[PDB]
Swiss-Prot record:
Chain positions of all zinc fingers (RING-type): 18-53
Gene induction: Up-regulated by endoplasmic reticulum (ER) stress triggered by thapsigargin or tunicamycin.
Function: Able to inhibit growth in several cell lines.
Localization per Swiss-Prot or TrEMBL: Nucleus; Endoplasmic reticulum
Protein name: Cell growth regulator with RING finger domain protein 1
Tissue expression profile of the protein: Ubiquitously expressed with high expression in testis and the cerebellum.
Gene: CGRRF1
Length: 68
């Protein structure tokens, strides 16, 4: 029972998300830089940061009070 609205999306559907698959929520930091642009899986896809391209020496999952 609609008129013809074939486009229902929020103001902005992009923020602190993966810049590789933009499908899953990034929950891993790429230290040192500590950039979260790689999903739990994409984190292994690129040994470096897809933003700063810094040799990833250590990586940990946020798993904190920071979530949407
Ligand atoms: Zn991803
Ligand atoms: Zn980075």
């Amino acid at each position: 029972g609609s008129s013809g609205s074939s486009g229902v999306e929020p103001s902005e559907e992009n923020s602190k998300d993966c810049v590789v698959c933009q499908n899953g929520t990034v929950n891993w930091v790429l230290l040192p830089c500590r950039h979260t642009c790689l999903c739990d899986g994409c984190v292994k896809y690129f040994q470096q940061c897809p933003m700063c391209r810094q040799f990833v020496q250590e990586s940990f999952a946020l798993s904190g009070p920071s979530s949407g």
